[PDB]
Design a protein around this nucleic acid. Sequence first.
RNA 1: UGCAUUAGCUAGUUGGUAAGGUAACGGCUUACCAAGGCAACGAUGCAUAGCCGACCUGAGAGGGUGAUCGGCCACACUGGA
RNA 2: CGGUACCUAAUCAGAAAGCCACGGCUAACUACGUGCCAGCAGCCGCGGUAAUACGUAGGUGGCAAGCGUUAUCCGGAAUUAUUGGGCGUAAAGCGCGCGUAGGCGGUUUUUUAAGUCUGAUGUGAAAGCCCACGGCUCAACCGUGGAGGGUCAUUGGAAACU
Lengths: 135, 80, 198, 131, 89, 156
Amino acid sequence: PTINQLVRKPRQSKIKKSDSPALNKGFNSKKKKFTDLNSPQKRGVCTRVGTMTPKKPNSALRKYARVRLSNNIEINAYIPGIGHNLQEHSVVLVRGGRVKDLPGVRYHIVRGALDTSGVDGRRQGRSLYGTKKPK
Amino acid sequence: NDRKVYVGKVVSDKMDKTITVLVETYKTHKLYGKRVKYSKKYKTHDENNSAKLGDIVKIQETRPLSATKRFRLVEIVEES
Amino acid sequence: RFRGSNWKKSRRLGISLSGTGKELEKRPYAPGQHGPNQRKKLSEYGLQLREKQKLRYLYGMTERQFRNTFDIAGKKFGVHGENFMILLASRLDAVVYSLGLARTRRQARQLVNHGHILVDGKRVDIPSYSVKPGQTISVREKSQKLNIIVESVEINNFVPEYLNFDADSLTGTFVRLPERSELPAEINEQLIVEYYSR
Amino acid sequence: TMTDPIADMLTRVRNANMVRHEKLELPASNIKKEIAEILKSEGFIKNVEYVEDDKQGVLRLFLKYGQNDERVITGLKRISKPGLRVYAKASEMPKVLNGLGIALVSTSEGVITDKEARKRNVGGEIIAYVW
Amino acid sequence: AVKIRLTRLGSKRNPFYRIVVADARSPRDGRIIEQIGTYNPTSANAPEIKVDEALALKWLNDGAKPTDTVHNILSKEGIMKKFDEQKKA
Amino acid sequence: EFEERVVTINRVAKVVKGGRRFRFTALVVVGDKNGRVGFGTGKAQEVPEAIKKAVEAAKKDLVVVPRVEGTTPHTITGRYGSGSVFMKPAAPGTGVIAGGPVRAVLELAGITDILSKSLGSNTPINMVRATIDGLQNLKNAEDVAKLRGKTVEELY
RNA sequence: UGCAUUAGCUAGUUGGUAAGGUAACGGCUUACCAAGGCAACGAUGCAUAGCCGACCUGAGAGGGUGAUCGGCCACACUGGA
RNA sequence: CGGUACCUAAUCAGAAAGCCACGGCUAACUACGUGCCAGCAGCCGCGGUAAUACGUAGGUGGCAAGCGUUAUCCGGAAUUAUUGGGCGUAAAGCGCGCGUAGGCGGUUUUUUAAGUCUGAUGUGAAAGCCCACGGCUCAACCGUGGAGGGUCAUUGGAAACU
């Protein structure tokens, strides 16, 4: 554009959309609103735990968990690891991060935070998947 | 000390001793650096309905004489 | 700090110089289970890394002390690739090692740790004191005679240039800042500086 | 209804330089005459000529070329322009092409070169870059 | 009332005091009128009083009151002794 | 004597009715660290023979790089199609900072201290030619005064 | 600061002449007289946000933030006095 | 604060390392287990019987009282481009006119000083940023002296360009 129609209509930027849009909304219960405070984690109670199959050339069945968080919104959340302890009504700490080759789930679960316990036998990549030092 | 000494151009002589001059100057733009004219209607206090529409008027600021006029007349450089 | 074997680090890098040589026993390529093999050739980011490690494990530092003493070499008028060399040998680890009070660098660093120096006056027991040009480095009067101290002076000669040394209570002087000639040029400083440019 | 005269001057010079022309003519001015007078003093053109006609007398330029068929002016850029006039103080008055090319600048003494504006300690509207 | 005070700077277990003519209702480390000089108790041997005495007497002649420690600072140099000769003349 | 340096090898196959093809090509940069640098490409199947095909192809086109010492003479931008490098002179103790393919065409002439940034496109064929075309259009201070008619001190 | 997918806002509102009253000028308030005032240079309306020194980032241009430390303003369960 | 900082002696190699990566970006790999399962994944993508990408074990490496993940911000991003981008076919020329406001406007002389340039002040507190010393056993930090206020306003001048 020329210099006059760029003074008269300035350079508006291109907005950046944040992934994990459920972790950056709070819920004031005394006013029933949605605040914005950019939380790194947010805990929640679980609703359904089943298995979901990938849609890629991959072929498996992945363990997800439908969790409603501190704010009253529903997500789907993946469980990393081997074994879990996630029947229903358990309190788990939702970690951000998308898992691809799975539709409609883009969050993890911190393995070992509130009520989920760590994996049964890892000793290699041990800090994530959350188990303590053996012996 | 001394007070500000602006010059302008009348816009609407309404009734009862008030004229409004139009001081026009050139603010520059922040980012692109292009000069651009802008206006500022300064209400001012005519003594006895002297100046008419079309005149260029030198003015000076004073104490607040009403709710919106803060300036007074000193001298008329040209008229119509 | 490191506390490990300088033999293995001298295998992967050039030399750590515990004795006069350390790589002649095993394969001088790499330590474990892939050393005696075909050495796959190495890219530019690797070789900008290896010469940085050959200088870091020489003086026995760690990063954000190796990095925080890098950008404060970007303050003087000289060449930044060798300002980082000259103020790295002006510590109380190299100066105790250069004017020989030890048979190696680690017990020289252990000598300045426990308080056997009393440099220019009372005491500096830190191993990262950058020595200004022109103040003396001694041994503590409480411990002037040890098996470690005296019996490593007589073996290692060649107190390097821009230094002094004596037998009257072992008093070096640190005349001025040493040159790139009077500094070990086995590791080239001309490629470490591009690692911290990224 | 051409709207920038001395940019139309400056692209007549560039287009004649591209086809190895050695002689072109301008509808002239004072600032067109005295920019064209300052290129021969710095040594980009051979010789400028007279102003003669009844209305807006023309002048001819006589471009100058290297002995191996090279050209002297390699690149020619108008910097100040209508809509966005650029002005320079004498402190940040910029060197063209690491001091190689020049920058004719209209200051309050008549227009002068890049060299002749810092030691005079005057700034003004910076007209163009010649290199 | 304006009064010459001590605004403390410096770190924990290392006090450093700049001396300041300021109003009595401002906070301690807050807004000032003019900063006369410094004071340092925790140096080698001295207190290291720096006072531009030509300017400290501009405030003592129109209402500034030293408060019990800068009155020792000004007496250590000798401003308060020389303050009488304006009143005596 | 010339100093060989590769940029990248490429693994290119053209589709055939039967078995597809095994052409491995490579571009190299050839210079002498004194002000004379050329590039070239080479297509073969034997990979060390595919290198030396590109080295001798670089030998037919060497461009003389003018130089005020330890840096480049002035500020230029090279252009060839979509690739466009930037080239600012620097102090003689800065170190040459450059990208992947443009570092090899800048180290092989002796500069070792310039600012640079490869604007525009990304493919290593174009930016090594949009750097040579930049280094083609550099001018010394002494030879401009030959054309302009002044002396070296009259230009300043 | 963001919206024109907010284009008509004002009616003590804009002047006047009086009178009161304020530390002080004044549509600050109350009487009459006059119909003005502001606005695409964004009046108004809605939404958001204490502002700045500064801090973080960037080669710069510029972008982001207001914890701590200072300057100023506003508020003190909510709303008047 | 506080019998605290610190200083003298006495004793002992005692008690004082983990953490994530190992396909290619990205310097560090072999072997068993498992065999589109269990699982990994920042990107491209790994696993169907000889997995350097899964799980473990021995190695090695990054650096370390930390390490790694996540969240948010700036940079890389010249992917809002004044510096510093575009519109034949990749996203982008209104279906074309008449015209309001606005923006921009041929040549010369005289002239004024709004823009512009230049030099006299005044001010943009302190703290910090940059630079130089001083005090911390070094460093963090702290203190003092300087770039310096370059934004602006007041005051002389210059007259080419708007």
